Amino acid sequence: DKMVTCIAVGLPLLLISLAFAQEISIGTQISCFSPSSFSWRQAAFVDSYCWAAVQQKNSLQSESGNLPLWLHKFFPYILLLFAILLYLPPLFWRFAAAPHICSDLKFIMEELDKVYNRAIKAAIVEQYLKTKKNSNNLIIKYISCRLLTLIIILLACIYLGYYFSLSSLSDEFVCSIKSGILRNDSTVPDQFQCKLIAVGIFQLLSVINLVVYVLLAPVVVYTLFVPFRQKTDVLKVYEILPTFDVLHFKSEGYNDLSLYNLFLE
Amino acid sequence: DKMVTCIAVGLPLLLISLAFAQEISIGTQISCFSPSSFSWRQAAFVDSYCWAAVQQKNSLQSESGNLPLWLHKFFPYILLLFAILLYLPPLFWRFAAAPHICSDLKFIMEELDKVYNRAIKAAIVEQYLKTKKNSNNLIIKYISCRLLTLIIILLACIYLGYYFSLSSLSDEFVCSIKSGILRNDSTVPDQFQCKLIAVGIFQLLSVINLVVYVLLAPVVVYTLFVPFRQKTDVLKVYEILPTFDVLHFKSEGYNDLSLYNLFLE
Amino acid sequence: DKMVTCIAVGLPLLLISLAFAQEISIGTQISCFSPSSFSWRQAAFVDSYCWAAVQQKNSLQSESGNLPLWLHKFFPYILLLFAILLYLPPLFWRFAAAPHICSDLKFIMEELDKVYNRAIKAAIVEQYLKTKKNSNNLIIKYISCRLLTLIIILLACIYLGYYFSLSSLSDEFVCSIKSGILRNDSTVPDQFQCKLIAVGIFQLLSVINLVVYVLLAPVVVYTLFVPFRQKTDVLKVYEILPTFDVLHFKSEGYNDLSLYNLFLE
Amino acid sequence: DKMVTCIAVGLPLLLISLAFAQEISIGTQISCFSPSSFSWRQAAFVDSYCWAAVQQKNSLQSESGNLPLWLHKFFPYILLLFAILLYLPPLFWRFAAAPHICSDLKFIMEELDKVYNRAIKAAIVEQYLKTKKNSNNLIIKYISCRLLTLIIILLACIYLGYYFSLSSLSDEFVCSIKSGILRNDSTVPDQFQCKLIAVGIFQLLSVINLVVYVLLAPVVVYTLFVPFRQKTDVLKVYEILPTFDVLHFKSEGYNDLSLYNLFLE
Amino acid sequence: DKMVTCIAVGLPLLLISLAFAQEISIGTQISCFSPSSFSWRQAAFVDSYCWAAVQQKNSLQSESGNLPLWLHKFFPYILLLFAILLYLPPLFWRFAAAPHICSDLKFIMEELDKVYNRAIKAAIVEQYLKTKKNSNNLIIKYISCRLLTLIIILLACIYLGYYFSLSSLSDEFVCSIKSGILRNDSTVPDQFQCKLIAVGIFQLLSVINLVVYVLLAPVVVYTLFVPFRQKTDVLKVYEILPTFDVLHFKSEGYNDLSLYNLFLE
Amino acid sequence: DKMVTCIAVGLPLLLISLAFAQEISIGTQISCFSPSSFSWRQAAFVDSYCWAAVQQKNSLQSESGNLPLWLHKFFPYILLLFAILLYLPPLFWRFAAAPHICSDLKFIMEELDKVYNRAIKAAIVEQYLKTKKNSNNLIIKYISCRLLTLIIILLACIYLGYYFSLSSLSDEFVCSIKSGILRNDSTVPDQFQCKLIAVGIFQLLSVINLVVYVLLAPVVVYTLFVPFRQKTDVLKVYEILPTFDVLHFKSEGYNDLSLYNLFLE
Amino acid sequence: DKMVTCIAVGLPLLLISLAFAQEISIGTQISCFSPSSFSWRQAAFVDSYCWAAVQQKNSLQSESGNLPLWLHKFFPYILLLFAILLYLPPLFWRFAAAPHICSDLKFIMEELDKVYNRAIKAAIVEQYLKTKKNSNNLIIKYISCRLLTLIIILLACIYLGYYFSLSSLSDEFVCSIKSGILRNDSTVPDQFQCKLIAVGIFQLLSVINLVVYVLLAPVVVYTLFVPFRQKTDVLKVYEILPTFDVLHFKSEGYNDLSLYNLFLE
């Protein structure tokens, strides 16, 4: 499991730590330029207004190119989703395949202690391969949780890949106070080309989540092709190669890996 | 239980984490526009006044359409209720059906070890189906706690569904200081069309709670129709299908899932 | 105990969590309107003065109707009392009836294992009903701690019920600085009709504590009338129905709930 | 011990929680009225000066009536003392009588298991009343720690009782900056009738500590008069009634409280 | 040990809690009076300068009487030392006498179980008084750690006793900015008679540490004179009275304190 | 393992603690010089703008020499990577070689207890050197995780070595507000030669990470040359010297290191 | 070990607590004197500039005497190093001598239980002194970690000893804004003789670390001269005196320290 669970534990934890590293250096999020201390609380009001009138005006006030993109106000808010959607199919395996594979773990531990007392009497296990010869289409439910994550990883390497072509000059947006003008239509300056503060490290942290998950998307497929390279097809390996690894994974003893020493000597 | 308790544990925890994610980015809640630094503490007083004169004036000062809606000042305050009302029927099951099903768990574990020593002597359990043949109308009390949650989930997908048709322009409300005018009737500007800061992420977080619970409301009903598809009606299954799952849920051994291996070989 | 202790544990914890939810959104408590930045520290002094001259002036400066009500400055301060006064008779039961009922729990566990070895020899308990036939007026001390809570719950549904008829316009109070005038009698504006900030959510959170405890006051009485409906009066049930529940509450075995299976088959 | 240790554990913890509840709502402590923003840091300096020139000027600058009372700057500072002075004689009992009463607890547990094996042989304890017949004047050291607390409780109901007659108008004190005048004797306004902010809740929290400890001072004496009402005087009960309770307090068994069942049947 | 370790554990913990109680109410430490808002950052600079030019100017700028006293800037800083210097000789006992007295504790526990099996055979210990008859001058190393603390306690009751005669008017000190004048020699006002904020509670908390340690200095000597009153001198008691207490301190049994019951009956 | 794991545990923890020590003294990060209080919120806006227009302008506004270096805004952000890239090959060893070496640890513990019972019978192990004589090319996978870290350590001593030649005057950068000018092209001063605050301790903390890792890069190679100095080449030692250390590393007994005592006597 | 490990545990912990005590009272670190509120953000910029232009200007702007001393900006930053460099040779002992001395601890515990069963049979150990008679030059590696710390302690008493002769007037430094002048060469005042705030307690806390480590440097050497005073030289004691202490250090029994009682009687 380590070849899969190492990734499935470390990399969502990598993403939540990489979100929390940006959460260290928040401070504020936008800094609006009020007309050079014509007030102080009107400055905070303009800041709040433009921080909430990012998305509701669907007309052309930003004009930097395809402004319906919500000005990426949501990278912790999206990154938490993209962490938990990778975290969850491990929980689905743990809540749909873990007790059955735990009973099968007891079965294969009974197989190895039956091998041990067979060697004791030598100083039946051959029927257990018949117990794992059968149809057993339920193991493909277990392999789905790996391949379901690989869909979300693939679109993660697409969604962040949109962000770099996006972020040329998708920060310096103009913002009006138009209902604020519609208070009076009288005195307030009409628009304030404010600036988001986080676009500099939203970009150069979306390098790291992208290029790591680029360096990992073929790696999960490599676990799924050892079933192709081990003498039987993917519709036959389900009780062998998901069992051949786990037999040596949990526990062995003084006869398991001393078979081949005694097989060679 | 995992097909139900997975949802019943994760999804209220999902909702409290999704409330705490908004609790990260609070800052302030309203930003009132005082007349361009004619004071600083009058600005904070106008902010406080309008943040508490949201609901008490039942007259038409907002006029954006059906202003008796309390301007949704309560989404953590409502979301905590909608989390605990889903959390509580699990506690009602745990405080009304858990010791009786624990004694029944000891009974079915005695059934499986009686099967085990029956196989030992083969190297009485048939009366236990008569023990679960009887009337036992108390198991419908256990199935009520699932279906009680599905009522609250259904109205959760209605209450949030009101919010999106609500939130067209139900933020930019005018607010007067009228008792504040009734201090003097003299000098203060008469109304301040302030703006709530949280309407931008109250909307686009009520997507996520809605569409997930939309994607889950038929799923709980699927657990309640396996009783329809298993040879006896819902007024007969109560001691079979709430027992057929739990027999394999808690613990098995070297004879339970090796029955069918020995039944086939 | 679960039919009582579920309420007695959850609902004071409900009230302390419901107080802490208001403790999340404190910020400040009053916002006094100083004369439009004629100072900044005089504004904070007027705020502090009026926040402490709420109650000490017993004369008519508020005039909104029966101003000796302390302007409800104490809802966490009162709600903590109304939580601990419901928490404490469980502690009084635990410090006056728990070791005696623990010894009686050992006695009834001896009764059930005597039933078990009686069935073993069948493959004296009849004297124990004589041990619980006697006068035993001390069990009414145990039933007092339930009914003492129901007094405090009843006045809780009265005290909060005063608050809604109270809170029509019992916020906008006028406040003078009269000893502050008696510093000089010269220059300071004479009164400031300030405004408490918490009256909007003190009201609509006293809905929830009221209507839940309205939905719970008859429920505790239902536990006290099963003694009426079980063949003997309230001055006879004390060693039967406080013992009939606890025999099945703590632990049973393979003979207790298999009596009726063997009684029917 | 529960009739004493319940009070001795809960009520000092009550007082430290009741101090921490005021520690929640500190904010600031005094708010001095500088001359209407003639500075900002001179305002904080006047605030600090008057907050430290409360007590050092023993002359008549407050004139509200017997101003040597330190203007009660110390209610957490005094309340911590009045909590730990009630907490400490339990520690004195635990460090002067607990190992000896633990050995006596082993002795009386040997007495009850000797009763148990006496009933086993029936299917010497009479000498142990001679072991507790003797002079044993050291048990009066144990009863002193109860009565030492009752002295501190009695003066606690006197010291707080001074505070309510004190606090008529012992807040609005005049404060000069006289060494501050003695800097220059030139320009600063000569006195500032500042105001402590905490006098409103120092009063109406000294209700609760008073009236609870009023409701508890006769209750501790009731434990000391059961020795008067149990057939022997206070200079004879010391090895009976401090032992009659503890025999049933720690542990009993299937023969102790089944004596009277077998004594009656 | 309780007659010593009760003090040695509680009273340094008393002093660190009594320092932390002042650490609750820090706020700031000095408040310098800049010339009535002639700046704001010059006010903070004057505050910082005078808070660091307390001690470095050894000339007469304070003139309140013997100004080389560092204006007591160090009461948490000194009180931590006076707590740890009392804490440390317990650690010196624990690191120089605890394993040897633990082996002696095993020896005296062997003495009492040898007494127990001597009573069993009655139904050699007399040589052990010869084992503790010898010279053993190393026990005076153990008694030094008590008397070393009593030196530090005695000077603690002297050092705080200096502070009350000190603190008449050793707060209102004049402070110049002379190198600050030596920037320009031009415009800044030449001296600022600032005021430390903590002198009011540094005084009336040095009551409590003084009068408690006054009430404790003869008490430690009382433990050292029970060796004088127990039939042998201080150069003979070292293996008797440091052993007579510990024999009953750790553990006894059904024969130790039932000796005198059987000795009397 | 201690000769490697001591470094591999302490030194990434050294780097994260050395990053957190700079995280103690953050305060702010840049301090832009607005035109001498021509506003306050324009000052914060200029600060935010220049803190995010560090990298996006790739033209010559800094001109201090090769300004595409991102002005080292990322030393915690880079140092976390350089800590976890050294932390991770220990995890790769733990997830790829730890269970196999744990089974081999059980094998060599069986070898030493076989030696022990061989000495018991003296009052087969010679075949185990044949079990570790074989080809076993998988141990070179274990030695890769040491040498993979030494690549990252080597470039760490290069990347920090760039920083000292970098940081001559790569702090005082000019920053314009050009889109801010492109708001109006009217009134705002055109550029602000701001200054990063952290360049003084980014330099003199990159001493410590450099010179320690300079003092450690040859040390890891010394572990890899004991295989050269122990009678067999690196393609033969893999089952001897990775086993000769671990035999004495985990546990020995009364015969292992008493071999040579009995071999010499 | 207590004579060494007491120091090696307490005194680096003393230094980290003594650094954290200064970390309590940080506030700010420098307070620059801008020209008397000619701005507010220019004041913070001058403060930041001079706090980072301490060290980079190597020319004569401070002129207080040998200004290349970095104005001691690093006392927590240096004190952490001087704590961990004393902490680390205990870890080097624990990772280079602790398992070997643990096996030797098992060997000497086997020696004492062999003495115990030798006394049992009396109701071979003489060969073990031959086992510790041999060459064993590896124990000098263990004594190096004590003497390596004594080098760092000695230079600690030199480095702090530089600081007191340093700190006469090495605080009041002049600071220009010269690149800040090189923005304009026009209007800003040219230099600001600012002042570090921490020089007053950096001095009088470097008393305590100095004079304690002065009082400890000969004490570690005293442990290294008991090998000189115990009948064999330093090149012979290595298996006796590092073993004579540890035999009584860990555990003894009823025969070890009762040897001399039975040797004398």
Q: DSSP string of G89-149? A: HHHHHHHHTHHHHHHHHHHHHHHHHHHHHHHHHH--GGGHHHHTSS--TTHHHHHHHHHHH
Can you tell me whether residue C176 is helix, strand or coil?
strand
Give the residue ranges of DSSP H helices in chain E: 2-24, 41-52, 75-96, 98-122, 128-131, 139-166, 178-184, 199-203, 206-214, 217-223, 241-249, 259-264
Give Cα E192 distance to the centre of its chain.
Answer: 38
Beta-carbon separation of B44 and C32 below 8 A: no
> What is the spatial distance between Cα C176 and Cα C193, in angstroms, rounded to a whole number?
8
Cβ contact D107–E254 (<8 Å): yes
Chain A residues inside the 8 Å CB shell of F91 = 6, 10
Q: Tell me how close the Cα of C259 comes to any Cα of chain D, in angstroms.
A: 25
What's the rounded Cα separation, in Å, for the pair C199 and C205? 10
Q: Quick check: D261 and C96 CB within 8 A?
A: no
Produce one character per residue of F103-114: b if its CB has 16 or more CB atoms within 10 Å, e if not.
bbbebbeebbee
Task: Name the token pair of C181.
Answer: 């005038």
Q: Using alpha carbons only, what angle is made at residue A261 by residues A258 and A264, rounded to the nearest 5 degrees?
A: 145
Enumerate the β-bridge partners of residue A30. Answer: A196
Sign of CA dihedral F181, F187, F191, F196: negative
Contacting residues of C for D31, CB less than 8 Å apart: 44-45, 47-49
Q: Does F248 contact G55 at a Cβ distance shorter than 8 Å? A: no
Q: How many CB atoms lie within 10 A of CB C107?
A: 20
Overall size of chain G counted in residues: 265
Residue pair B219/B14 in contact (Cβ under 8 Å)? The answer is: no
Radius of gyration of chain B (CA): 29
Q: How many domains does chain D have?
A: 1
Residue type, F16: I
Residues of G in contact with F198 (CB under 8 A): 52
A67, A181, B189, B193 from A174: Cα distances, Å? 11, 15, 29, 22
Query: Cβ separation of F40 and A40 shorter than 8 Å?
Result: yes
Query: What's the CA gap between D117 and D122, in Å, rounded?
Result: 8
Indicate the residue type of B223: T
SS3 for chain D, per residue?
CHHHHHHHHHHHHHHHHHHHHHHHCCCCCEECCCCCCCCCHHHHHHHHHHHHCCCCCCCCCCCCCCCCCHHHCCHHHHHHHHHHHHHHHHHHHHHHCHHHHHHHHHHHHHHHHHHHHHHHHHCCHHHHHHHCCCCCCCHHHHHHHHHHHHHHHHHHHHHHHHHHHHCCCCCCCCEECHHHHHHHCCCCCCEECCEECCHHHHHCCHHHHHHHHHCCHHHHHHHCCCCCCCCCCCCCHHHCHHHHHHHHHCCCCCCCCCHHHHHHC
Interface test with A, best of B13, B14, B33, B203 (most A CBs within 10 A): B33
- For residue G19, count other CB atoms closer than 10 A to its CB: 19
Backbone Cα Rg of chain G: 29
Check E254 against D54: CB less than 8 A apart.
Answer: no
Range of the domain at C33: 2-264
**Which of G9, G18, G33, G201 would best serve as a mutation to test chain E binding (most E beta carbons within 10 A)?**
G33
**E196 membership: H or E segment, kind and range:** strand E195-196
**Residue C49 contacts residue D195 (beta carbons within 8 Å):** yes
- Does residue B28 belong to the interface with chain A, where contact is any CB pair within 8 Å? yes
* Token pair in block for residue A136: 């057993």
Q: How far is CA C122 from CA C114, C115, C119, C125, D264, in A?
A: 12, 10, 5, 14, 29
CB C170 within 8 A of CB C69: yes
Burial of B160 (0-12, 13-18, 19+ CB in 10 A): buried
CB F33 within 8 A of CB F192: yes
β-pair type (G195-196, G30-31): antiparallel
Q: Which of C205, C18, C234, C26 is nearest to C139 (CA)?
A: C234
Cβ-based burial of D91 (10 A; exposed 0-12, middle 13-18, buried ≥19):
middle
Q: How many residues does chain C have?
A: 265
Strand, helix or coil for residue G176: strand
Cα angle, residue A93 at apex, residues A91 and A97 outer, rounded to 5°? 135
E129 φ, ψ (degrees, to nearest 5):
-70, -25
Neighbouring C-beta atoms of residue A135, cutoff 10 Å = 8
Cα separation, C67 vs C60, whole angstroms:
7
DSSP state letters, B140-157: HHHHHHHHHHHHHHHHHH
Q: Mutate which of C33, C208, C216 to disrupt the B interface (most B C-beta within 10 Å)?
A: C33
- Contacts of F247-253 with CB under 8 Å at 24 or more apart are F247/F108, F247/F111, F247/F112, F248/G99, F249/F1, F249/F2, F249/G99, F250/F105, F250/F109, F251/F109, F252/F112, F252/G103, F253/F112, F253/F116, F253/G106
Residue A211: name the closest of A164, A255, A260 by CA. A164
Within a domain: D113: no
Q: Which residue of B has its CA nearest to C195?
A: B49
Q: Which residues are within 8 A (CB) of F3 and not within 5 positions of it... i.e. 6 or more apart? A: F223
Among C residues 169-228, those touching chain B with beta carbons less than 8 Å apart: 171-172, 193, 195-201, 204-205, 208
Stated as kind and residue range, the H or E segment containing C142 is: helix C139-166
B224/B140 Cα distance (integer angstroms)? 12
User: Quick one: tokens of D43?
Assistant: 């305002």
Q: Locate all alpha helices (DSSP H) within chain B, ordered by sequence.
A: 2-24, 41-52, 75-96, 98-122, 128-131, 139-166, 178-184, 199-203, 206-214, 217-223, 241-249, 259-264
**Left, alpha or beta for C4 (phi > 0: left; psi -120 to 50: alpha)?**
alpha
Q: What is the 3-state secondary structure (H, E, C) of G196-227?
A: ECCHHHHHCCHHHHHHHHHCCHHHHHHHCCCC
Rounded CA gap, G54 and G73, in Å? 9
Closest Cα of chain D to C264: distance in Å? 33
Q: What separation in angstroms does the CA of G155 have from each of G86, G150, G159, G165, G210?
A: 12, 9, 6, 16, 10
Tell me if D111 is assigned to some domain.
Answer: no
For residue A176, give the H/E element and its range: strand A175-176
How many contiguous H segments (helices) and E segments (strands) does chain G have?
12, 4
The sign of the torsion formed by the CA atoms of E124, E130, E136, E142 equals: positive
Phi and psi angles of residue C71, each rounded to the nearest 5 degrees, phi first: 55, 30
| Residue A149 and residue B162 in contact, taking contact as beta carbons nearer than 8 Å | no
Amino acid at B28: T
Which one-letter DSSP state was computed for residue C195?
A: E
What distance lies between CA B135 and its chain's CA centroid? 33
Residues E255, D108: contact at Cβ < 8 Å? no
C-alpha to C-alpha distance for F145 and F122, rounded to whole angstroms? 43
Alpha-carbon distances, residue G122 vs A78, F193, G110 (angstroms): 80, 92, 18
Q: Does B236 touch chain C (CB under 8 A)?
A: no
User: How many beta-carbon pairs below 8 A join chains E and G?
Assistant: 91
Gap between the Cα atoms of D92 and D145, Å rounded: 7
Here the tokens at position G129 are 């002194």
Q: Is A191 helix (H, G, I), strand (E, B) or coil?
A: strand
Render F2-33 in DSSP notation, one character per residue.
Answer: HHHHHHHHHHHHHHHHHHHHHHHT-S-SEE--
Q: How many CB atoms lie within 10 A of CB G161?
A: 14
Q: Which of D41, D136, D188 to mutate to test the interface with E (most CBs of E within 10 A)?
A: D41
The region that residue C66 occupies, defined by phi over 0 for left and psi between -120 and 50 for alpha, beta otherwise, is left
Nearest to B149 by CA among B79, B215, B220, B214: B220
Residue D45 has which token pair? 């300096």
- Beta-bridge mates of residue G30: G196
Question: Best interface-test mutation with F: which of A41, A61, A172, A264 has the largest number of F CBs within 10 A?
Answer: A172
For C84, the token pair is 């601990």
- B2–A40 CB contact, under 8 Å: no
- By the 8 A CB rule, do D258 and C131 touch? yes
CA distance F176 to C115: 91
Residue B165 phi/psi, 5° resolution?
-70, -25
Q: Is G touching E (3+ C-beta pairs, cut-off 8 A)?
A: yes
Task: Report the alpha-carbon distance of residue A110 to residue A103 in Å, rounded.
Answer: 10
Are E199 and E171 in contact, with CB atoms under 8 Å apart? yes
Q: Does an H or E element contain G195, and which?
A: strand G195-196
Q: D258 phi and psi, to 5 degrees? A: -100, 5
Which letter does DSSP use for residue G173 in this model? -
F52 interface with A at CB cutoff 8 Å: yes
Nearest by CB: G200 against E54, E99, E130 = E54
Q: What is the spatial distance between Cα C258 and Cα B107, in angstroms, rounded to a whole number?
A: 9
Q: Residue type at A258?
A: S
CA distance A247 to chain B (A): 17
Q: How far apart are the first and last CA of chain F?
A: 32
User: Gaps after which residues in chain E, C–N over 2.5 Å?
Assistant: 123
> What count of Cα atoms within 13 Å lies in the side-chain half-sphere of residue G137?
0
Query: How far does C202 lie from chain D, in Å, by closest CA?
Result: 17
Subunits next to E (3 or more Cβ pairs <8 Å) are D, G
Sign of CA dihedral D228, D232, D238, D243: negative
Spatial CA neighbour of E243 closest among E167, E142, E119, E146: E142
Side-chain-side CA neighbours of F98 within 13 Å: the count stands at: 10
Q: Which of G40, G103, G130 sits opposite F37 (nearest CB)?
A: G40
What's the rounded Cα separation, in Å, for the pair G93 and G138? 12
Cβ neighbours for A113, distance < 8 A, ≥ 6 positions apart: none
Chain E positions touching G6 (Cβ under 8 A) are 91, 95
How many angstroms separate the CA atoms of E153 and E148, rounded? Answer: 9
- In this structure, what token pair is assigned to residue B260? 């069918």
Please name the residue that has the structure tokens 């929680």: D17
Name residue B195's beta-bridge partners: B31
State whether C48 and D197 contact (CB < 8 Å). yes
Burial (CB count within 10 angstroms: exposed 0-12, middle 13-18, buried 19+), residue F7: buried
Residue F152's contacts (CB-CB under 8 Å, 6 or more residues apart) are: F82, F85, F86
D18-47 burial code (b ≥16 CB/10 A, e <16):
bbeebeeeeeeebbbbbbbbebbbbbbbbb
Strand partners, G31: G195
Residue E187 with chain G: CB contacts under 8 Å: 36
Minimal C-alpha gap between G143 and chain E (Å): 21
CA distance C41 to D41: 10
Beta-ladder partners of G195: G31
Tokens of E216: 């404790």
Place of tokens 């009783």: B227
Q: How was this structure determined?
A: cryo-EM
Note the helical H segments in F67-168.
75-96, 98-122, 128-131, 139-166
Query: Would you state the structure tokens that stand for residue F181, as one six-digit string?
Result: 């000018």
**B98 and B5 Cβ atoms separated by less than 8 Å:** no
Choose among D52, D91, D130: nearest Cβ to E200: D52
C-alpha distance across the termini of chain A, in Å:
32
CA distances from B148 to B142, B154, B221 (A): 10, 10, 12
